[PDB]
Every structure is written in structure tokens, then in C-alpha cells.
Scaffold this motif. Structure first.
Motif, mmCIF file in Angstrom:
data_model
loop_
_atom_site.group_PDB
_atom_site.id
_atom_site.type_symbol
_atom_site.label_atom_id
_atom_site.label_comp_id
_atom_site.label_asym_id
_atom_site.label_seq_id
_atom_site.Cartn_x
_atom_site.Cartn_y
_atom_site.Cartn_z
ATOM 1 N N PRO A 249 0.819 -1.223 0.000
ATOM 2 C CA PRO A 249 0.000 0.000 0.000
ATOM 3 C C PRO A 249 0.849 1.267 0.000
ATOM 4 O O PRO A 249 1.883 1.321 0.660
ATOM 5 N N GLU A 250 0.419 2.269 -0.757
ATOM 6 C CA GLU A 250 1.079 3.573 -0.737
ATOM 7 C C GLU A 250 0.611 4.378 0.477
ATOM 8 O O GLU A 250 -0.158 5.328 0.352
ATOM 9 N N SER A 251 1.079 3.992 1.655
ATOM 10 C CA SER A 251 0.622 4.622 2.885
ATOM 11 C C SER A 251 1.617 5.594 3.528
ATOM 12 O O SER A 251 1.393 6.038 4.645
ATOM 13 N N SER A 252 2.688 5.960 2.824
ATOM 14 C CA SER A 252 3.703 6.850 3.411
ATOM 15 C C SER A 252 3.182 8.235 3.831
ATOM 16 O O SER A 252 3.684 8.831 4.794
ATOM 17 N N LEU A 253 2.185 8.750 3.118
ATOM 18 C CA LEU A 253 1.571 10.012 3.515
ATOM 19 C C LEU A 253 0.870 9.874 4.865
ATOM 20 O O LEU A 253 0.983 10.765 5.711
ATOM 21 N N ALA A 254 0.180 8.744 5.063
ATOM 22 C CA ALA A 254 -0.524 8.447 6.306
ATOM 23 C C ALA A 254 0.447 8.219 7.467
ATOM 24 O O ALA A 254 0.240 8.742 8.562
ATOM 25 N N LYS A 255 1.494 7.432 7.213
ATOM 26 C CA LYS A 255 2.537 7.152 8.204
ATOM 27 C C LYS A 255 3.175 8.469 8.654
ATOM 28 O O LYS A 255 3.341 8.714 9.854
ATOM 29 N N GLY A 256 3.489 9.327 7.681
ATOM 30 C CA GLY A 256 4.053 10.650 7.930
ATOM 31 C C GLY A 256 3.173 11.621 8.690
ATOM 32 O O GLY A 256 3.685 12.490 9.399
ATOM 33 N N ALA A 257 1.853 11.481 8.552
ATOM 34 C CA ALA A 257 0.898 12.328 9.281
ATOM 35 C C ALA A 257 0.467 11.702 10.611
ATOM 36 O O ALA A 257 -0.338 12.275 11.347
ATOM 37 N N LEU A 259 -1.182 8.837 10.973
ATOM 38 C CA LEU A 259 -2.477 8.181 10.867
ATOM 39 C C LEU A 259 -2.327 6.688 11.170
ATOM 40 O O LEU A 259 -1.280 6.095 10.888
ATOM 41 N N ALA A 260 -3.366 6.097 11.758
ATOM 42 C CA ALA A 260 -3.357 4.677 12.087
ATOM 43 C C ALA A 260 -3.259 3.815 10.825
ATOM 44 O O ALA A 260 -3.907 4.094 9.807
ATOM 45 N N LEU A 261 -2.429 2.779 10.913
ATOM 46 C CA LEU A 261 -2.237 1.849 9.818
ATOM 47 C C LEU A 261 -2.909 0.529 10.151
ATOM 48 O O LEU A 261 -3.043 0.165 11.328
ATOM 49 N N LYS A 272 -17.008 4.201 7.454
ATOM 50 C CA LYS A 272 -17.268 5.304 6.539
ATOM 51 C C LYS A 272 -16.015 5.765 5.772
ATOM 52 O O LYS A 272 -16.010 6.852 5.202
ATOM 53 N N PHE A 273 -14.968 4.934 5.765
ATOM 54 C CA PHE A 273 -13.673 5.243 5.113
ATOM 55 C C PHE A 273 -12.896 6.358 5.807
ATOM 56 O O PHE A 273 -11.942 6.894 5.251
ATOM 57 N N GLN A 274 -13.314 6.713 7.017
ATOM 58 C CA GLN A 274 -12.605 7.727 7.784
ATOM 59 C C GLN A 274 -11.331 7.146 8.390
ATOM 60 O O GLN A 274 -11.359 6.068 8.997
ATOM 61 N N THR A 275 -10.220 7.865 8.210
ATOM 62 C CA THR A 275 -8.949 7.519 8.854
ATOM 63 C C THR A 275 -9.041 7.849 10.351
ATOM 64 O O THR A 275 -10.116 8.167 10.860
ATOM 65 N N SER A 276 -7.914 7.798 11.057
ATOM 66 C CA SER A 276 -7.904 8.191 12.475
ATOM 67 C C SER A 276 -8.026 9.707 12.655
ATOM 68 O O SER A 276 -8.184 10.197 13.777
ATOM 69 N N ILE A 287 -6.041 0.985 1.377
ATOM 70 C CA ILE A 287 -6.765 0.818 2.648
ATOM 71 C C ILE A 287 -6.962 -0.624 3.088
ATOM 72 O O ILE A 287 -6.910 -1.551 2.274
ATOM 73 N N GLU A 288 -7.192 -0.787 4.388
ATOM 74 C CA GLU A 288 -7.576 -2.050 4.954
ATOM 75 C C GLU A 288 -9.075 -2.229 4.744
ATOM 76 O O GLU A 288 -9.857 -1.297 4.951
#
Ligand SMILES: Cc1cc2nc3c(=O)[nH]c(=O)nc-3n(C[C@H](O)[C@H](O)[C@H](O)COP(=O)(O)OP(=O)(O)OC[C@H]3O[C@@H](n4cnc5c(N)ncnc54)[C@H](O)[C@@H]3O)c2cc1C
Ligand SMILES: Cc1cc2nc3c(=O)[nH]c(=O)nc-3n(C[C@H](O)[C@H](O)[C@H](O)COP(=O)(O)OP(=O)(O)OC[C@H]3O[C@@H](n4cnc5c(N)ncnc54)[C@H](O)[C@@H]3O)c2cc1C
Ligand SMILES: CC(C)(COP(=O)(O)OP(=O)(O)OC[C@H]1O[C@@H](n2cnc3c(N)ncnc32)[C@H](O)[C@@H]1OP(=O)(O)O)[C@@H](O)C(=O)NCCC(=O)NCCS
Ligand SMILES: CC(C)(COP(=O)(O)OP(=O)(O)OC[C@H]1O[C@@H](n2cnc3c(N)ncnc32)[C@H](O)[C@@H]1OP(=O)(O)O)[C@@H](O)C(=O)NCCC(=O)NCCS
Ligand SMILES: Nc1ncnc2c1ncn2[C@@H]1O[C@H](COP(=O)(O)OP(=O)(O)O)[C@@H](O)[C@H]1O
Lengths: 555, 554
Positions: A249-257, A259-261, A272-276, A287-288
């Protein structure tokens, strides 16, 4: 509703689908779509076919153009633009214009992440030096691979990884007249399907002159990638390499902010597709998801889910939540030369991993009425709970009518139908299209007979050990069919003679029956049970057995 | 314990019930009685054998008497016609077809699957029409093929344009025989609606079939070679195929004083029991409830007959009785290069029952258009605006039609609504589908109506609307205007429309059309959000132009 500023990261399956519906829901929202590549909504799925020359027009790969889409949906679309950082407490993202090198901050009310998944690039010694090594994700990747073929004239190609994409690349390279070797660390191509189903696929690939290397990996790349050294010690001389060993997954933006992985580094989202973060949503490959069948957290990188998620997200943003994402069933399909191979739900390997008790049936049935020209076999594997009839998954292969059968079964699963319901699906019947009982009805009847206790069965992988242990195996085929081969220890009593030859059947041994496909063995099983014999039928009969264990066939 | 089960009729329902009964019990005495020479013949294959598509006559025989009787220990009696049920004695009277000799046979349980027979109208001169044929069995098929071989007919007349008449049209045409189809209705294929039939008609005309609608045969003259039509027109012909429907073969039941249903069908309960507790009945001969509205009807199709037979076997000797939830009426026909499929109810029936409904027509490609040889699939979905209940669907196109109908028929039987169709995760790769399947797409279109995101009008409404103050905007690109437009249309291309909003009158009801409806829907969304009263013309110009080609304006 009050207008907001909505920023979408990624301009393909998830991003484009959410942006278009968002616009249809509101004329007043400011909608910005940021895409690091040159193109939005390209046909990722078509890439192998363009390489193979099946898709002849590069331009057909552009599903929407930036110009057309921005105008149609009044979208602020920014290609060649990379989001490099999310600043969540500030509610801005940082964007780099790749062309001009200018960077700037873009404020958002809602941020939607659909950045997809990148190819896994393994640390193989010599991989940096490999001149003709390629991964496939986007249009530039495609151009590069195609340019190499057209200009350097490779005569042999090595494909590393036998997933649905590696396999499609195998076909398309063959189509160009390139000799192909496929290298897989597993004992089968296509992880989604089970081993005995892959056995059919392997046959079809080898018949199109593909060399299959299993339970081997690249140990080293030597000679600038012209020499592939396998873990075993074997060597492949090759002119080019395609890497298709999966995606991450391209989750580096989330990891950097912060956000829960979720599992495997996916971006974690709620119903509802809402992140943390309450203002940041995420969809697509990154996404998971829960699988529909068991509601187990997983990652399933497919286009239908990405499109469905983007589409639903637009509604959700606007407070239309009467329908939330039910999870991913994992319905998939691939063309493999002359074969279609499809899958939905879970396979045996996953269900064993999850400690879930199941039963299987393999039913081969004609694509349409045999009396009408050009009928071809469709094989359906159906996996289910013996007690409830709950369908865990299905796999189907054949030359025609496979996609149809998968779609019906996949539809049934999502509609919470059980195997006991499949025989009651009133499907389209006329000679060119089906039989009075469709293959789907047929697999349903077979599974229902196990659920209802009309038949007890053993598998291809069980029968030999059963025979060694004193199982009495009766082959109910006609004597001429035995020239195709037989299972060791078989005793031939033709089905149509069986009722007349009951005295030959031992009442002091556990009886096992096989025919060619399972059908006649089942009829024989029914007969013997009613006569008070303990009996089990070999599921899929000899045809299945001989495909998966050809080295064990007795002639 | 053991029972003596007697099955009347040895084909679809009869062979299906008989084989499963044996698999359930080895003890039972099973007798199957058939008046014809063959059991389990491919009734459905008959037209394709006539057309020379099925080349082997022997392929029409699915299982032989000897093989099946051996396999399932069945007492199978061909050339034996049951002439009478003696329900007080629990016997039936059987007549040898060859010798006319009769005998009685006692039963514990009796199962009637006698099928249906062709409707023969009272046409003056029909008794003299040497080259008039109906099609039901193998002998009928042999006679037709023999006639063709012996007389080399240049032209054939098919009377009745239902699924069977149309198949006969095709198979005769492809033999190089000129064909005129004569139909009483204003369309072929009663299960589909008029505007969907328009597509079939055009295709049939493109294959050089002469189509005659709202007409009938008043007289057959010169031994059938002269067809006098009600319109005055005269057809010269070398053979006639009569395919104007079937009626239930219920005489055995009628004669035994059993309850009858609609069209003279054998009335049965949910377990296929007649008004006599030891007589059961399945197949074309029985009354069924339609799945959608549970209205008493008669739907003579093979899937139901085969399904009813397996279920009835289970009711008698299987486990927990499953009850028949009625017939959905899923059907499909090949019509030259087209597949045409239907399921549930059409507008004509819904209107007759005064049931409120909406419809959408969504044309989408069989698979992704960036992959070779994609072809349109037109899906019409009929539904309840409030509940989203699916009433029926019809579909046509060159490929991928059976697949879309099967998915929709599955959803309907699974009690899904139009709102669930978008969420069906189907098989997607370039050769097979799109990221949103046609089924998903028609689901989205219907859902937008249910949820009030768009309001729509039909092909049959738009002209009147335009006559009476409607403002109609055609949002196609100018290039797409090649095949014409709806009268009164003003072209503002979708991609220009947001910039040209000042051109849209605000005090008028706005109507929008595009080519297929998708872009008109996008326009409608936009205009609704900008405060306009707007409706989309369902199916766009392509549907409109197909059904009303004489009204097309250039
Ligand atoms: C060769 C190939 C064949 C396939 N075939 C099939 C198939 O037959 N069927 C099927 O169901 N699926 C198939 N897939 C998978 C399918 O393409 C994906 O499931 C789908 O595209 C995922 O959607 P997405 O929006 O998550 O990601 P993508 O479609 O990959 O879009 C994500 C986009 O976001 C951009 N991006 C990422 N990070 C940033 C950033 N920081 N800033 C700006 N932009 C960024 C990327 O450049 C990318 O364009 C195939 C995939 C490949 C590679
Ligand atoms: C040309 C043609 C094409 C068709 N194509 C399709 C298609 O494409 N798809 C589809 O779904 N359906 C099709 N059908 C309809 C399909 O054949 C029927 O729905 C199905 O056969 C009904 O099964 P049944 O057992 O009720 O009747 P049948 O299969 O007709 O069997 C009834 C049998 O009972 C026998 N019988 C009747 N009375 C007596 C008696 N007194 N004593 C002994 N025997 C008796 C008859 O001789 C007949 O053989 C087609 C029909 C025709 C004629
Ligand atoms: C094309 C793409 C931008 C989607 O944009 P879109 O505007 O939603 O276009 P679609 O064709 O999906 O349109 C569907 C809409 O039109 C409607 N529609 C379609 N045909 C219709 C018709 N004949 N009449 C009325 N409405 C129709 C549907 O109801 C739906 O509306 P809704 O979403 O508002 O309910 C996006 O799917 C994409 O970029 N795809 C390619 C990328 C990709 O999927 N990659 C993965 C690998 S292939
Ligand atoms: C074919 C006909 C004789 C029915 O006989 P049948 O023995 O039920 O044959 P089918 O192929 O339908 O049934 C297959 C049986 O084997 C089972 N089976 C099929 N493949 C199997 C497999 N691979 N493994 C285990 N079981 C299998 C099915 O479950 C079913 O048994 P069940 O009903 O006890 O569950 C009858 O339907 C007929 O006459 N058909 C042609 C006539 C017709 O339909 N006409 C209308 C116009 S075409
Ligand atoms: N007298 C008649 N002349 C011409 N067509 C007729 C006449 N009576 C009925 N029809 C038409 O014949 C068709 C029969 O359709 P269908 O019920 O499917 O019969 P089948 O099952 O034999 O195909 C219908 O379209 C009907 O309108």
C-alpha cells in the motif's frame, strides 16, 4: 448543505470515481484532484494488453483526459503534482509541481487519500545493474517495456511472480513472439486459487509453450540481468525481466501524518472510510478492508472495490450513509490464453489458516447444452459449511461461460444465499446459452447433497492414503475410459452393470467410488448407500485426480 | 418401505422427477409412461436441427430408453398413451399407440408432466394446407426437414412472432429460405416491451426477414400456397410454420375431475399436489404463481419444469420440503446476431395490473471499451420508486447478455432491490467487464430515481412534452448529431453547458437528452443543483430513434 473544499490525492480508480460523484452531489464544492503522474483515469488493467499488441492504440488507455474531465465536472485537476506531506492539524497538504519544482500548501476541509499500491521491488543482488528489468504500474512503465521490445528485439523473457498480473504478462509476451519463462516461489501460479485448480492452468500455459519454474526464486541477477541464477542453482539466460511479485500500500503520507495503519501497512479506516483523523478519508488499494465472507481484516487490491469505495465515499461525505461498505468479496477473473480463471471469497489455504471447517465440491458441467455446437467444459469448485450451507468461496475455470458462472455465484454470496439456494436460481436457458439446469444450479445440487447427507465424499489428496490403508476403490467408468488412466488399487465395475453385480461388492470394507467427473460415482454412491453399504465418492473423479497428480496415474 | 410411483410424460419434468426419485429410493417401483417414441429428447434443439446448425439428428436424443432404464432401474414405456386416470381405483388406463390395445396400471402416487400442445387456430382452408407445420416433437421435426428436402421451399411463412416463431424465422432464413413473419401484435416477443422489440425488428429486417404486424391470416388458399391476410395483403408461400402459443395438456386432469387454473392449467399447491392427494403435477401443464407479484399464470419453460421435477422428488422421498416460490420467467432467445433476454414482468403486464413502476434503459459495453470487440448491452430495469423492488428486466445485444440477465435474475430471487445492484462485486478484467459492470450501472441509474437525484421521462412521453411547453436540450457533442435528433431539441454540449447557463430559461421545465442517457443525467444533476426544474430523457436519442425512427428530425 454547506459548500466545502475537497482535495483528492490520486487521480485514477478511487480518486476519479469519488471526484465525479462528488461533483454530481454539489455544484458549489471546490474539488481539487492531485495526481503525480501525467494522466488521470488511465486503464491500469489494460496495460499488459497494450504491451501484447492486443490493444493497438495507446490513446485507448486514457479513460478520461484532464481537459475533458475538468470541464465536464468543473474539477481543478493537477497532474504532475506530488503530495509530499499532509499537515493534519493545520488542514493543509504540501504539493510539489514536478515540472516547475515549485512547492506550495493547499488548504482542505476534506482530504481523500486514494494513492493506490506500488510494486514490491525485492533486494536481489545485481538488480540495480539489471538493464532489462521492469515493473508494471503506470503508462510510462508501459511505454518503457514496449519501447524495449520494439527496439531491442528480446527473444526470451523471464517473468518473476505468477499472480494474475504476472500471468497476463506471460500471455502478452508470448503474443509478441517472445519465449517466456515464469519463476514462482510457490508450487502454483495464481495465489487466489487452490493447487488442484492451478493444475489445469499450468497445463494450458505449458501447452502455449511457457516454461514454468516452481518452488524457486531468483537468487542473483548476473551479466547485467541477462543471467538469472535461481535459488536451486539453475540458470536462465534471458533478454528481459518482468517483476510481478505483488504490491504494497502507498501509505507513506498516512505514516508521515501519524495516521493509524492497518494490516500490511494499509491505511486504517472505519465503516465510513474515515482515517484516524476526522477530516481525512481513504479508499482503494491503500486501505484495509474486511473480507465479506469472514469479516477478517485484509488487503485486496482490485478495481471494482476501488471504484465502489470512491463512489460510496462521495455519498457518505454528503451524509448519505444508509448504505455503508460491506467489505470486499474478492471476486476476480483472468484470461489465461484460451482459459478464463475466476475466483471469489476464500480458498482452502486461507480457510485452513483461519481454522474454519469446510467442505468442497468440484463439478464440471458444459458451458451450454451439449447437443448445441461448441459447448465447452466449465469446472466449478464450491467451498462451503457442511452445517449451515454458508458459501465461503468459489473458483471456476474453462474456455467459455466462466465469467457468467462466477458472477452468479458472487452475486449469491453477497446476497447471503447458501448452497441450498443455488439450485433454485432461475437462470437463462436456451441451447446456445446454458442447460435446463445451469452449471451454477448443478454445483449447488452437488453441494446440497453433502449438506443434506445424501452423499459422503473424499478428496483427490485423500484417496491414495485411503487405498493404502485398506479402502476398496471401485471405478464405475466403462472399461474403455480406463485407457485414460486410473487411480492405483481401482477395481472396475461399470455403473450400469453395478446393480447387477452387487455380489462383487464387499460388505466388510469401506467402499470408495470414482468415475470420470464425479457424477456417475455419486449415482453409484446413492445406490450403494440405499443398499446399506458405507460408501464415499471421490470428488471430481479421475479427471480431476489425473490433472493434479499425473505422476500417480496407473495405466 | 416401498411405493409404486407412476410418471406420465417422459421428457423434461417426467425424466427429471424419475431420476431423482431413484437416487432417493432403490426400493420404489418407478414407471414412466410416454406416448411418443423417445424420452428426454432435446425439444429446445429442434429449430437448430431444422436450421442445419445441429447437424446430427442423434444429438437431439439426450438419453436412450435402454440406457436410462438400466441406469435408474426405471420401467420406461414409450409409445404408451395414458388415456384416463381412474382416481377412485388409483389406476390409470394406458393405450398402446401401435395397436390401440389398452390395459390398467395401479399407482400409489401419480405424477403428471404431460407438457403443452400448440394452439391451432380456425383458419378457413387450414385442413387443405399440406405444407402447414407445428413444432413440438421429433416426428414434427422430421416432417418439416423432409418437406424442405423434398420440395425445396423458396419462401416460408411463420405465423406468430414469439420466442419459438422467431427462432424458426432464423433457422429457415439461414437455410436460404425467404421468410415472412406474420404477427397479430405490434411487436415480436410478447415478454419484452415495445421499444425493446424495436431493436429486434431492425435486426431481423437487416437479415432480410419481411415483418408483418397487426395482421393475421383470414384464409389459406391454393392448398396453403396463398396466404390471405386480414389487411388485404396476399403472401405467396411454399410452407407455413404455425407458432402462436401452447395450451396446457390437462385433459387427463380435467377428465379425472381435478381442479383447473388459468388457461386450463392443472391447479396445484405449493408442493405440486393436485386436488387429489395422490396425484401430483409439474411442467408446462401447471398453474404457477409468478415470483414477483404472486399472480396465477402459466409460464411454459424448461428450467421450471426441470426444477419442479427435482423438487417434487424431494417432497416425496427427500428431506425437508422446499416449497416452490413460483416462476420468475427468466427466458432467453438467440435472434440472429442478437441475444434477447427477459425476467419478471414487463410494462404491459404491470399496467394491466395497475401497479405503479418506473423504468430505466441503460446501455453499457459488454466489457471495457479500451479492450477489443466490446459491444453494447442494453438493460431495461423495471422497479418500484418507493421500495426499489425489482419488477422485471429485459436485456439485448450481441454478447454478454445472458450473463447480465442471470445476475439480475439472481438478485430478484434473492429479494435484492435496485439499491443493492450497485454493490454486486462481479468479475472484472478487460476481456470480461468494466470496473462498474452494466448490472452495477443500471443499479446506479435506478437508485438515483429511487433516491430523487434525478427525475425522468420516457421515449413515448417526450414529443407530447415538447408540444406542450417543454424546453428540450440536447447535450451531445455536435459530431454525435449524425443520426438526427428529437424534434424541438436545442444543442448545448454537456461540456459547454456550465458556461452557457444563461441560455437555459429559468421559468420553464427543462428536459435533457444525450445519446444514451448518461450525459443527460450529468446535465440534469448540474441543472438541479443550479435550481432548475429538469428531467432526463431515459435512454437518450439512441433509444428514441430506434423506437420512433419516423419522428427523427435532421
Ligand atoms: C498491470 C495491472 C493490471 C491490473 N488488472 C486488474 C484487473 O484486471 N482487474 C482488477 O480488478 N484490478 C486490476 N488491477 C488493479 C487495479 O488497477 C487497482 O486495484 C486500482 O487501480 C486501485 O485503485 P486506486 O485508486 O487505489 O489506485 P491507482 O489506480 O493506482 O491510483 C492511485 C494514483 O495515486 C497517485 N499517487 C500516489 N501517491 C501520490 C502522491 N503522494 N501525490 C500525488 N499522487 C499520488 C499515483 O500516481 C496513482 O496514479 C491491475 C493493476 C495493474 C498494475
Ligand atoms: C421448439 C421448442 C423450443 C423450445 N425451446 C425452449 C428454450 O429454448 N428454453 C426453454 O426454457 N424452453 C423451451 N421450450 C419449452 C420446453 O420444451 C418446455 O417448457 C418443457 O419441455 C416442459 O416440460 P414438460 O415435462 O412439462 O413437457 P414436455 O417436455 O413437453 O414433456 C411432455 C411429454 O409428455 C407426453 N404426454 C402428454 N400426454 C401424455 C399421455 N396422455 N400419455 C403419455 N405421454 C403423454 C408428451 O408426449 C411429451 O413427450 C421449447 C419448446 C419447443 C416446442
Ligand atoms: C470513469 C471514471 C472517472 C468514473 O467517472 P463517472 O462520472 O462516475 O463515470 P461512470 O461511467 O462510472 O458513470 C456512472 C454514473 O452514470 C450513470 N449512468 C450510466 N449510464 C446511464 C444512463 N444510460 N442513463 C442514466 N444514467 C447513467 C450512473 O447512474 C452513475 O451515476 P452516479 O454515480 O451519479 O449514480 C472512473 O471510473 C475512472 O477513472 N476509471 C478508470 C480507472 C480505473 O478504474 N482503473 C482501475 C484499473 S482499470
Ligand atoms: C437429463 C434428465 C434425464 C434428468 O436426469 P438426471 O439424472 O437428473 O441428470 P442431471 O444431469 O440433471 O442430474 C445430475 C445429478 O448428478 C449430480 N451431479 C452432477 N455432477 C456431479 C458431480 N460432478 N459430482 C457429484 N454429483 C454430480 C447432480 O447433483 C444431480 O443429482 P441430484 O439431482 O440427486 O442432486 C432430464 O432432465 C431430461 O430429460 N432432460 C432433457 C429434456 C429437457 O430438459 N427438455 C426441455 C427442452 S430441452
Ligand atoms: N392469429 C394470430 N396471428 C398471428 N399471430 C398471432 C395470432 N395469435 C397469436 N399470435 C402471436 O403469436 C405469438 C406466440 O408467442 P408464444 O406465446 O411465445 O408462442 P410459442 O410459445 O409457440 O412461441 C405471440 O406473439 C402472439 O401475439
Amino acid at each position: 448543505w454547506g459548500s466545502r473544499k475537497i482535495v483528492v490525492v490520486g487521480g485514477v480508480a478511487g480518486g476519479a470515481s469519488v471526484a465525479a460523484r462528488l461533483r454530481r452531489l454539489s455544484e458549489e464544492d471546490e474539488i481539487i484532484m492531485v495526481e503525480r503522474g501525467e494522466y488521470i483515469s488511465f486503464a491500469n488493467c489494460g496495460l499488459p494488453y497494450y504491451i501484447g499488441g492486443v490493444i493497438t492504440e495507446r490513446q485507448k488507455l486514457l479513460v478520461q483526459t484532464v481537459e475533458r474531465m475538468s470541464k465536464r465536472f468543473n474539477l481543478d485537476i493537477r497532474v504532475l503534482s506530488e503530495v509530499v506531506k499532509i499537515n493534519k492539524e493545520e488542514k493543509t497538504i504540501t504539493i510539489k509541481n514536478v515540472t516547475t519544482n515549485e512547492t506550495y500548501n493547499e488548504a482542505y476541509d476534506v482530504l481523500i487519500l486514494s494513492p493506490g499500491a506500488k510494486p514490491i521491488v525485492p533486494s536481489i543482488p545485481g538488480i540495480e545493474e539489471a538493464k532489462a528489468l521492469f515493473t508494471l504500474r503506470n503508462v510510462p512503465d508501459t511505454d518503457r517495456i514496449k519501447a524495449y521490445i520494439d527496439e531491442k528485439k528480446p527473444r526470451h523473457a523471464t517473468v518473476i511472480g505468477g499472480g494474475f498480473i504476472g500471468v497476463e504478462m506471460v500471455e502478452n509476451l508470448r503474443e509478441r513472439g517472445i519465449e517466456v519463462t515464469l519463476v514462482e516461489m510457490a508450487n502454483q501460479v495464481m495465489p487466489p486459487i487452490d493447487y488442484e485448480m492451478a493444475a489445469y492452468v499450468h497445463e494450458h500455459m505449458k501447452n502455449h509453450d511457457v516454461e514454468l519454474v516452481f518452488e524457486d526464486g531468483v537468487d542473483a541477477l548476473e551479466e547485467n540481468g541477462a543471467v538469472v541464477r535461481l535459488k536451486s542453482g539453475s540458470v536462465i539466460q534471458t533478454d528481459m525481466l518482468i517483476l510481478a511479485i505483488g504490491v504494497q500500500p502507498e501509505s507513506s503520507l498516512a505514516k508521515g501524518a501519524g495516521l493509524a495503519l492497518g494490516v500490511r501497512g494499509t491505511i486504517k479506516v472505519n465503516e465510513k472510510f474515515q482515517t484516524s483523523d476526522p477530516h481525512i478519508y481513504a479508499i482503494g488499494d491503500a486501505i484495509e478492508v474486511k473480507d465479506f465472507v469472514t469479516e477478517t481484516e485484509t488487503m485486496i487490491p482490485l478495481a471494482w472495490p476501488a471504484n465502489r469505495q470512491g463512489r460510496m465515499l462521495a455519498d457518505i461525505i454528503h451524509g448519505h450513509t444508509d448504505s455503508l461498505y460491506k467489505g470486499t468479496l474478492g471476486t476476480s477473473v483472468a484470461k489465461v490464453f484460451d482459459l478464463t480463471v475466476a475466483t471469489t471469497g476464500l480458498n482452502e489455504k486461507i480457510l485452513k489458516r483461519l481454522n474454519i471447517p469446510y467442505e468442497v465440491v468440484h463439478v464440471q458441467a458444459n458451458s451450454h447444452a451439449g447437443y448445441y455446437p461448441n459447448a465447452t467444459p466449465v469446472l466449478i469448485k464450491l467451498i462451503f459449511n457442511k452445517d449451515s450451507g454458508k458459501i465461503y468461496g468459489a473458483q471456476t475455470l474453462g474456455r467459455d461461460g466462466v465469467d457468467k458462472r462466477m458472477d452468479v455465484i458472487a452475486t449469491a454470496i453477497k446476497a447471503n444465499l447458501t448452497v441450498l439456494d443455488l439450485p433454485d436460481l432461475e437462470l437463462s436457458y436456451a441451447p446456445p446459452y446454458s442447460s435446463a439446469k445451469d452449471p451454477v444450479n448443478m454445483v449447488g445440487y452437488a453441494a446440497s447433497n453433502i449438506v443434506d447427507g445424501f452423499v459422503d465424499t473424499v478428496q483427490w489428496h485423500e484417496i491414495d492414503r485411503i487405498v493404502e490403508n485398506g479402502g476398496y476403490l471401485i471405478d464405475v467408468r466403462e472399461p474403455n475410459e480406463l485407457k485414460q488412466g486410473m487411480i492405483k488399487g481401482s477395481i472396475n465395475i461399470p455403473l450400469d452393470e453395478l446393480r447387477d453385480r452387487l455380489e462383487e461388492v464387499p460388505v466388510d470394507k469401506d467402499i470408495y467410488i470414482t468415475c470420470q467427473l464425479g457424477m456417475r460415482g455419486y449415482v453409484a454412491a446413492r445406490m450403494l448407500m440405499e443398499k446399506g453399504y458405507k460408501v464415499k465418492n471421490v470428488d471430481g473423479g479421475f479427471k480431476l485426480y489425473g490433472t493434479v497428480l499425473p505422476e500417480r496415474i496407473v495405466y
